[PDB]
Design a protein around this ligand. Sequence first.
Ligand SMILES: O=C1CC[C@H](N2Cc3cc(C4(O)CCN(Cc5ccccc5)CC4)ccc3C2=O)C(=O)N1
Ligand SMILES: [Zn+2]
Ligand SMILES: [Zn+2]
Lengths: 385, 796, 28
Amino acid sequence: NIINFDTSLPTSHTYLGADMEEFHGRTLHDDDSCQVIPVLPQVMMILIPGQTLPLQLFHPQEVSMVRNLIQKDRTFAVLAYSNVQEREAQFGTTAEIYAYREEQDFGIEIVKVKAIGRQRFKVLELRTQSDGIQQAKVQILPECVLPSTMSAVQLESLNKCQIFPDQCSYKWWQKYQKRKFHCANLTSWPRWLYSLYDAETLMDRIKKQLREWDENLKDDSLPSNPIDFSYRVAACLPIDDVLRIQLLKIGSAIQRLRCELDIMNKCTSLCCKQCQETEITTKNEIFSLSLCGPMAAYVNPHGYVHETLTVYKACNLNLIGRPSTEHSWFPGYAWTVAQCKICASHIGWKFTATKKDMSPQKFWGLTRSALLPTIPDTEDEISPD
Amino acid sequence: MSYNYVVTAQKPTAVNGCVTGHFTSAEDLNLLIAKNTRLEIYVVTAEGLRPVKEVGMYGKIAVMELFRPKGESKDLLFILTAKYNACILEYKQSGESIDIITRAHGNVQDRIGRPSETGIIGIIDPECRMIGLRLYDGLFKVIPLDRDNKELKAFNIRLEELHVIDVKFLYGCQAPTICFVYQDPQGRHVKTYEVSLREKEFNKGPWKQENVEAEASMVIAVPEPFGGAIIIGQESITYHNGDKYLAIAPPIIKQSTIVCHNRVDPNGSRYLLGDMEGRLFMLLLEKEEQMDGTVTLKDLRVELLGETSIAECLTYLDNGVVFVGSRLGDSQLVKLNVDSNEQGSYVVAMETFTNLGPIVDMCVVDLERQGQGQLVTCSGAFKEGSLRIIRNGKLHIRTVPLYESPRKICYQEVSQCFGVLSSRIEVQDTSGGTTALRPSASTQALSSSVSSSKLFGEEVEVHNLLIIDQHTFEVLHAHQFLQNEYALSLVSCKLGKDPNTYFIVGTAMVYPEEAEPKQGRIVVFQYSDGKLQTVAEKEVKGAVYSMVEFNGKLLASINSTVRLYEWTTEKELRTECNHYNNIMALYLKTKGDFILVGDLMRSVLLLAYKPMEGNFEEIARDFNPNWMSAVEILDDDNFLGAENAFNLFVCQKDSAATTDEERQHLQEVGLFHLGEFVNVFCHGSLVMQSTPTQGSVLFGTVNGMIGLVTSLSESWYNLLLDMQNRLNKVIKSVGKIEHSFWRSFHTERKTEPATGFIDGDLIESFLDISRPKMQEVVANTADDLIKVVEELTRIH
Amino acid sequence: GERPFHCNQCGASFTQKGNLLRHIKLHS
Ligand SMILES: O=C1CC[C@H](N2Cc3cc(C4(O)CCN(Cc5ccccc5)CC4)ccc3C2=O)C(=O)N1
Ligand SMILES: [Zn+2]
Ligand SMILES: [Zn+2]
């Protein structure tokens, strides 16, 4: 229950070795503009803007491509594959390299990279070049910003009341709703309806669920902008690729926040994807061992990326082999591979503390690719808004 | 691909602004009133108000201020529209000809800018050296007032205070000085800045910020000889002139927030203040007279004068007469009666001016005979609530005051009455329970009833179903709903094989802790033999946002579900089928076996009932994020909606398209900037019943404007579209605003030209133009065009 | 201490090669 670990360590990706050559600069292309961007060939990821993506590139063609990007814009395209086998992709996200390190260990040139999602895009065309490396003709998808739902109606005499400044939080939210949505009486709907489409109210409702996962402040950790908050929450929601792609396709932060709240309330169980009916854990065991939330992307020693969701308890898992601290994503913990007891598919790893004074003494790191969010009782699947 | 025609039946009646000055003549006192896209000019006579001129603008009036620059014989008028069209107008009359000539004009929009939260602010310097505008946060636009600035060129000054609440130019300053209330993490403060026209920047203001009231919202610049500024909040009215500071926290103002003001005395000794509940106060700054220092200000006072309509803007005219501009109720001319008890109040009404806004719902009814239809609206809100019966004579309007908010309305021909959902505010008692604020329709019914349960000073909303006689408009019955029950939808119809006509209400249980409603009811009532009874009651797991009679059945929307009920022989609702949607089913409209489901974010969905399977099937959808206020089915293939930044749009289905992706996609075929906010779409007409127009959809808006939409043929549309471009070359726009620019579909992120819509108001203005101008328009045949336009005027 | 056959994706360590090859074929 108590976290006697340094929450800032997994975000640093300290397992990638010595300090990388950090970049300060930031690049952004105009909305709706068309850009040709290189795609990394073995990256099988669906990246969210604001999400950190660590990589280890081994192939000389991949290493060359990154050396060129580091000198130029530092931006590559991360395709959201609808069909991974036939490499089909209609959407994706740009990724900007913010840290890198080249190593000629043993006698093999390998490059470790830390990138971040920046802009969503629509794939216009894909062509593999005579070198074997492919380029994507892309169109930068704009982020739909809507004004206050009350802006259209709003009485000009109440415009000066739209800025709002120990005491009872429920009484505060009651006053917030009465003042922000007073002009709802000029329309066909009540104040309480407009609250369901209000960024600050939706963000406060999400914060109430995020507080159940992390014992950390809104003040620092969480962003203020609905766009950034909605993407930060999307990055740490353990959902399957079909749902994540639909979530990514949403252009409005209001619809994204509403959609996330609905997933967070409906999907309370997490099953094995191959079994579909083997419960591994529930949302009540989810907890944040990293500042970015319960789930983040990490890279293994062979470049394989795993979005790892940390939980207190997991069931229906077999442990393969003995624990190892080799390349551990949670410094101070040893990992043991964990499979589903029914289908034997890899679900994640069990992390066990190296010192007695550490807390928690054990937890599980589950790979998102192996999980399936489930809604118990007598209902199948749906993502409203 | 759609060919639609939109025309105004009733101009907006809600008042968003009013100013006094000497605009028509240096000797005349004028009252200028802004009613959205309309400007009314009055001469304030000893009698009352003498109408002088009324003009229309190709914009929504956002700023309206009079000013007399150096030399000018009389005042000029600055106007800024919601699409940022700025202009300086002059009244000029030469014999018979009245012309509001445009002295200067230009668009002041910036390519880059976050439109401010506190909206547009437009202030003019007391010496008329410049116009200050706060359109975007972090910038203050300055239009220098020179005779050689006929294009209205402006520069911005960077403003580090990003959250400005209100700003005014101060009096008595050597340099033009702005005084403003702003908010930052630390709280609310009042700052000042000098405005250098030479350096095009701000310089250190004459006095300090201080941590003023947390709810300080209004700045009032006090004229000479006192100077300084008054800052009004929720609890306090404070004065600031740097070193001089005076504060008061009158308990009389604590009941409601003060939201408008007006100077009575030119010296700034007396001010009128209005609150959100119609109270009118007098603020007096007591000028004390010492021996040397004869200009002292000993104290501030507030006196409750009386009650007026809920005021959007006040203006003192003369001889105690005050014009009350109202958005929620009728506007008034009140006489501030000189020191008079009159059982408490000092304010006496002189005139009342009709305001249909906001029109939150309406219905058409044949009523007398049948031929000519009558429109019955749910107008006003709170004590200003009423029903308005609009018929063609000009439009003749009958008013029925309810003293509470009418919300929904439907007519029941069989019982010769209307069903009206209403709500009233009751305050919680310290003693226990709730007390009404005034007698209203729901507390003054002939007969009354309350629902049976199947489950401090805080304001509580009590919901009711009123039965109102169609002839007398008397409240025959009032049924009160359960505690925390919110009445959302109302229908009058016959269901199944039942010959009886019922009033069906759809509700939601609203609790502060719950964000999304998990309970609601569909209650079936019968009003028969002069009494209301509850026939049946169905509890549902959500809010019943909308309901429609669907081929002898009841189609109701519970949250994201759309459910079809059948009325059994046991007089009970039986769930036939459900349809679980990707969106919240707020809007529901039906034509035959087709259903139109929509949400507040313009997610449009089309469903069809499959009778041979007994279930629903999705036909098509279109999700473009934008706020949507109303929807309607024009015909089998076209859907009309009202979306953000006062636009109309039309979506079309194409059941013939080659692929199944195309035929389950709705094409946006019409876009138009209406300039009004539509709340209700309603099929019907106000004219008596082989026509160039097909169909008739009336609509009610927030500003009390009533419009009409009808469909045309491709030939009729192509002709009238060319006619518009020809009429624009000959017609004179106030402020020199482009018609094409005004009607262009507008959101802040995008502006597209209007498509699939004919501005009937522009087409009809052909009949008002002179014979030489008429011949200029028809130069490709003039009297044949007069027949076409006269035929188009007959639809309203 | 045996287990000289590791899965480069999850890190599963196997004592025989036929055991690792069955495990790697279960991954995507
Ligand atoms: O916290 C975590 C969770 C686990 C995860 N790992 C580590 C990992 C390591 C490997 C190896 O092939 C295993 C064999 N060693 C040689 C060797 C053998 C014996 C003794 C010493 C060294 C080379 C690397 C393969 C996959 C993964 C993986 O998925 C991670 O990176 N962090
Ligand atoms: Zn399994
Ligand atoms: Zn493996």
